[PDB]
Design an enzyme around this catalytic site. Structure first.
Site, PDB file in Angstrom:
ATOM      1  CG  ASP A  94      -1.692   1.203   1.428  1.00 55.13           C
ATOM      2  OD1 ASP A  94      -2.583   1.421   0.589  1.00 55.13           O
ATOM      3  OD2 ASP A  94      -1.427   1.968   2.387  1.00 55.13           O
ATOM      4  CD  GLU A 116      -2.069   2.682  -3.958  1.00 55.47           C
ATOM      5  OE1 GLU A 116      -1.388   2.973  -2.948  1.00 55.47           O
ATOM      6  OE2 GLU A 116      -3.127   3.290  -4.226  1.00 55.47           O
TER       7      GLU A 116
HETATM    8  C1  LIG Z   1      -6.005   7.202  -2.057  1.00 55.11           C
HETATM    9  C2  LIG Z   1      -4.611   7.295  -2.688  1.00 55.11           C
HETATM   10  O1  LIG Z   1      -4.130   8.606  -2.423  1.00 55.11           O
HETATM   11  C3  LIG Z   1      -2.876   8.943  -3.032  1.00 55.11           C
HETATM   12  O2  LIG Z   1      -3.018   9.008  -4.469  1.00 55.11           O
HETATM   13  C4  LIG Z   1      -2.770  10.273  -5.079  1.00 55.11           C
HETATM   14  C5  LIG Z   1      -1.795  10.014  -6.227  1.00 55.11           C
HETATM   15  O3  LIG Z   1      -0.575   9.512  -5.723  1.00 55.11           O
HETATM   16  C6  LIG Z   1      -1.570  11.293  -7.045  1.00 55.11           C
HETATM   17  O4  LIG Z   1      -0.774  10.995  -8.184  1.00 55.11           O
HETATM   18  C7  LIG Z   1      -2.929  11.836  -7.493  1.00 55.11           C
HETATM   19  O5  LIG Z   1      -3.526  10.943  -8.409  1.00 55.11           O
HETATM   20  O6  LIG Z   1      -3.794  12.009  -6.384  1.00 55.11           O
HETATM   21  C8  LIG Z   1      -4.063  10.804  -5.679  1.00 55.11           C
HETATM   22  C9  LIG Z   1      -5.089  11.112  -4.589  1.00 55.11           C
HETATM   23  O7  LIG Z   1      -4.575  12.126  -3.756  1.00 55.11           O
HETATM   24  C10 LIG Z   1      -1.823   7.892  -2.666  1.00 55.11           C
HETATM   25  O8  LIG Z   1      -0.635   8.049  -3.455  1.00 55.11           O
HETATM   26  C11 LIG Z   1      -2.321   6.453  -2.844  1.00 55.11           C
HETATM   27  O9  LIG Z   1      -1.330   5.572  -2.310  1.00 55.11           O
HETATM   28  C12 LIG Z   1      -3.647   6.252  -2.109  1.00 55.11           C
HETATM   29  N1  LIG Z   1      -4.135   4.854  -2.135  1.00 55.11           N
HETATM   30  C13 LIG Z   1      -4.003   4.047  -1.099  1.00 55.11           C
HETATM   31  C14 LIG Z   1      -3.454   4.483   0.250  1.00 55.11           C
HETATM   32  C15 LIG Z   1      -4.234   4.478   1.368  1.00 55.11           C
HETATM   33  C16 LIG Z   1      -3.643   4.921   2.684  1.00 55.11           C
HETATM   34  O10 LIG Z   1      -3.273   3.734   3.419  1.00 55.11           O
HETATM   35  C17 LIG Z   1      -5.665   4.007   1.394  1.00 55.11           C
HETATM   36  O11 LIG Z   1      -6.504   5.016   1.949  1.00 55.11           O
HETATM   37  C18 LIG Z   1      -7.736   5.498   2.115  1.00 55.11           C
HETATM   38  O12 LIG Z   1      -7.593   5.517   3.527  1.00 55.11           O
HETATM   39  C19 LIG Z   1      -7.190   6.788   3.992  1.00 55.11           C
HETATM   40  C20 LIG Z   1      -6.798   6.670   5.459  1.00 55.11           C
HETATM   41  O13 LIG Z   1      -7.884   6.129   6.166  1.00 55.11           O
HETATM   42  C21 LIG Z   1      -8.347   7.756   3.757  1.00 55.11           C
HETATM   43  O14 LIG Z   1      -8.119   9.021   4.354  1.00 55.11           O
HETATM   44  C22 LIG Z   1      -8.498   7.895   2.249  1.00 55.11           C
HETATM   45  O15 LIG Z   1      -9.546   8.786   1.947  1.00 55.11           O
HETATM   46  C23 LIG Z   1      -8.770   6.523   1.643  1.00 55.11           C
HETATM   47  O16 LIG Z   1      -8.725   6.612   0.232  1.00 55.11           O
HETATM   48  C24 LIG Z   1      -6.132   3.667  -0.010  1.00 55.11           C
HETATM   49  O17 LIG Z   1      -7.354   2.921   0.037  1.00 55.11           O
HETATM   50  C25 LIG Z   1      -4.975   2.940  -0.674  1.00 55.11           C
HETATM   51  O18 LIG Z   1      -5.392   2.163  -1.797  1.00 55.11           O
HETATM   52 CL   LIG Z   2      -4.213  -1.338  -5.828  1.00 55.13          CL
END
Ligand SMILES: C[C@H]1O[C@H](O[C@H]2[C@H](O)[C@@H](O)[C@@H](O)O[C@@H]2CO)[C@H](O)[C@@H](O)[C@@H]1N[C@H]1C=C(CO)[C@@H](O[C@H]2O[C@H](CO)[C@@H](O)[C@H](O)[C@H]2O)[C@H](O)[C@H]1O
Ligand SMILES: [Cl-]
Ligand SMILES: [Ca+2]
Length: 496
Positions: A197, A233
Site C-alpha cells: 500500500d 501500489e
Molecule cells: C487514495 C490514494 O491517495 C494517493 O493518491 C494520489 C496520487 O498519488 C496522485 O498521483 C494523485 O492521483 O492524487 C491521488 C489522490 O490524492 C496515494 O498516493 C495512494 O497511495 C492512495 N491509495 C491508497 C493508500 C491508502 C492509505 O493507506 C488508502 O486510503 C484510504 O484511507 C485513507 C486513510 O484512512 C483515507 O483518508 C483515504 O480517503 C482513503 O482513500 C487507499 O485505500 C490505498 O489504496
Molecule cells: Cl491497488
C-alpha cells in the site's frame, strides 16, 4: 519478487474486499479452487482504528494501530485457518500491507481499535508495536502543515503525512525491523505475497531494505527458495517526478493507466474506439507487461477515491464492465486482478458520492457473512463479481490460453474487433451501433465450441450459444448491438 507463486495453470487474483476470513476460507474450497482462481488479495489483516464518525468506513483499515492480526475480518486463529485451508486447495493469499504509516495524527487517544490496543496519535505512542515519537518523520518533513501538499516535490511525497496519516521513519533499522517482523509472521502462516500500500510514499530503497529482511515462503506449500510475490501500489499517470519504474527492483507495480484508458475506450469517449486495442500494452504507453499488475477498477477508484477518473468502469455499469474485464482477461498483457465488491448507498452531491466512505454490509458494525443464493450469486449486499458467469469463465479462458501469442486480430475500423490466443482461444466483441455478423479466422481446430460468455459446457452439450469452426479455422459470429453481453469467447476446453 516477480513470480506469483500460484499453482501451475492459474493466472489471476481476486480482491475479496472486506470479506471475513472464514468466508474466504469457504470460498477457496467451494469455488475458487474448482474454478481455477490463482489467489485472493485480502484486506489489511493488522489491527486498525475503529472509526465511529462516520460509522465504520472501509478506510479505517488503512489506519494501523498495531501489527496484531485482529480486525473486522477475524482474529489471528481465523486468519491462520483461512491461509491453511486456501493453500491446501491450491489457492494463494496476498496481503494488503499497510506499512508507510500508522493512523491519522488527529485521531483521539484511547482503545478505539479492532483489538482494543491503546494508542495515542498526539503523543506518537503505539505501545502495542511499540513505536514512539522517534519512529515518525515529524522532524524530517518540511511542509507548513506537516502533510503532503504538492506531488511535484518528491521529498515531501516520501517524508510528509499522506492525508495526515502519521508517517513512519522507514530509514531507521528499528522501524524496518518491526515491519519485517509483521511480514514474516504472515509469510510463516503461509501467505504468498503482498500488495504494498502507498508505495509512492516510501523510497524504493526503504522498501528494498524491508524486503531484504523477509523469510522464504512456507516450505510445506512452496518450493525451496520461493520469495513473496510483491506488487506495489503506485499511481503514475505521468507528470510527476516519481515514476512506476522507480519500483521495478522490488516487484511488480500497479498500472493505473490500464483501467483509465480501457474505460475510456469501452465508453467510446474522447473519440476512442476498440479498433485501437490492437496496440494494447506497451503500444498504448503502459509499462513492461512483465511488471504490470492490471485491473479494470480497484477498491479506491470504483468509489472515486485515489486518482478516481470518470471513465473507470465498475459493477454499477454492468454491461460495459463485463466487456472490459473480458478483454483484460483475454489479452496477454500484465498480471490480472479481478475486483469483488459490496453494494453501498451511492448519493451524489456537487458531482461526488457523499457516501463513498460506507464500509461493508454490517449489523451495527459487525461485518455480514457472505451468503450464496441458489443461482450461485451472493446475498447480504455482496456483489461477487467473480461469480458472474461471464467473468468466472474468462478467468478460466486466461488459464487455458496461458503462454499463447496474441494473433488473428480483426477490426472494422470502429468498434467490432476480434482476436485469438495461439490455437487455444478466440474472442469477438461488438461495441458498435449495428450488428456484427461475419465469418472470421479463429486459429482453432475444427469442431463445435461452447460460447463461455452466454453459457457453459456440461455433459457433452452447451447451455448457451454454440460456435461452429470449420476445417479451415473459420467460424460465423453474429452479435447484435443490443445484445446484453455483446461478446463471445471460445477455447480449447469449451470444445464439445
Ligand atoms: C487514495 C490514494 O491517495 C494517493 O493518491 C494520489 C496520487 O498519488 C496522485 O498521483 C494523485 O492521483 O492524487 C491521488 C489522490 O490524492 C496515494 O498516493 C495512494 O497511495 C492512495 N491509495 C491508497 C493508500 C491508502 C492509505 O493507506 C488508502 O486510503 C484510504 O484511507 C485513507 C486513510 O484512512 C483515507 O483518508 C483515504 O480517503 C482513503 O482513500 C487507499 O485505500 C490505498 O489504496
Ligand atoms: Cl491497488
Ligand atoms: Ca512516507
Amino acid at each position: 519478487q516477480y513470480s506469483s507463486n500460484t499453482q501451475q495453470g492459474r493466472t489471476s487474483i481476486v480482491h475479496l474486499f472486506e470479506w471475513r476470513w472464514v468466508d474466504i476460507a469457504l470460498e477457496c474450497e467451494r469455488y475458487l479452487a474448482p474454478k481455477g482462481f490463482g489467489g485472493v488479495q485480502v484486506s489489511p489483516p493488522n489491527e486498525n482504528v475503529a472509526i465511529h464518525n462516520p460509522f465504520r468506513p472501509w478506510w479505517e483499515r488503512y489506519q494501523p494501530v498495531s501489527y496484531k492480526l485482529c480486525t473486522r475480518s477475524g482474529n489471528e486463529d481465523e486468519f491462520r485457518n483461512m491461509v491453511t485451508r486456501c493453500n491446501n486447495v491450491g489457492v494463494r493469499i496476498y496481503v494488503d500491507a499497510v506499512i508507510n504509516h500508522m493512523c491519522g495524527n488527529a485521531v483521539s487517544a484511547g482503545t478505539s481499535s479492532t483489538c482494543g490496543s491503546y494508542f495515542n496519535p498526539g503523543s506518537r505512542d503505539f505501545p502495542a508495536v511499540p513505536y514512539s515519537g522517534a519512529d515518525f518523520n515529524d522532524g524530517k518533513c518540511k511542509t507548513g502543515s506537516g502533510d503532503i501538499e504538492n506531488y511535484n516535490d518528491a521529498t515531501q511525497v516520501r517524508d510528509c503525512r499522506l492525508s495526515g496519516l502519521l508517517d513512519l521513519a522507514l530509514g531507521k533499522d528499528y522501524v524496518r525491523s518491526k515491519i519485517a517482523e509483521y511480514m514474516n509472521h504472515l509469510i510463516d502462516i503461509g501467505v504468498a505475497g503482498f500488495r504494498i500500500d502507498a508505495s509512492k510514499h516510501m523510497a524504493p530503497g526503504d522498501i528494498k531494505a524491508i524486503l531484504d529482511k523477509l523469510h522464504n515462503l512456507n516450505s510445506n506449500w512452496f518450493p525451496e527458495g520461493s520469495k513473496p510475490f510483491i506488487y506495489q501500489e503506485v499511481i503514475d499517470l505521468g507528470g510527476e517526478p516519481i515514476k512506476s519504474s522507480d519500483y521495478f527492483g522490488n516487484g511488480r507495480v500497479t498500472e493505473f493507466k490500464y483501467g483509465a484508458k480501457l474505460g475510456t475506450v469501452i465508453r467510446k469517449w474522447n473519440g476512442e474506439k476498440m479498433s485501437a486495442l490492437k496496440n494494447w500494452g506497451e503500444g498504448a504507453g503502459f509499462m513492461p507487461s512483465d511488471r504490470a499488475l492490471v485491473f479494470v477498477d480497484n477498491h479506491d477508484n470504483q468509489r472515486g477515491h485515489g486518482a478516481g477518473g470518470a471513465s473507470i468502469l465498475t459493477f454499477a455499469d454492468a454491461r460495459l464492465y463485463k466487456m472490459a474485464v473480458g478483454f483484460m482477461l483475454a489479452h496477454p498483457y500484465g498480471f490480472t486482478r479481478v475486483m469483488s465488491s459490496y453494494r453501498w448507498p451511492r448519493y451524489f452531491e456537487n458531482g461526488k458520492d457523499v457516501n463513498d466512505w460506507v464500509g461493508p454490509p454490517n449489523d451495527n458494525g459487525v461485518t455480514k457473512e457472505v451468503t450464496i443464493n441458489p443461482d450461485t450469486t451472493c446475498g447480504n449486499d455482496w456483489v461477487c463479481e467473480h461469480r458472474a458467469r461471464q467473468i468466472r469463465n474468462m478467468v478460466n479462458f486466461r488459464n487455458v490460453v496461458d503462454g499463447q501469442p496474441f494473433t488473428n486480430w480483426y477490426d472494422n475500423g470502429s468498434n467490432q474487433v476480434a482476436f485469438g490466443r495461439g490455437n487455444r482461444g478466440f474472442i469477438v466483441f461488438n461495441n458498435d451501433d449495428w450488428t456484427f455478423s461475419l465469418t472470421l479466422q479463429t486459429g482453432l481446430p475444427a469442431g463445435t465450441y461452447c460460447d463461455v460468455i452466454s453459457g457453459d459446457k456440461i455433459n457433452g452439450n452447451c447451455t448457451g450459444i454454440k460456435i461452429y469452426v470449420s476445417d479451415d479455422g473459420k467460424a460465423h459470429f453474429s452479435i447484435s448491438n443490443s445484445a446484453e453481453d455483446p461478446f463471445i469467447a471460445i477455447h480449447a476446453e469449451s470444445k464439445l
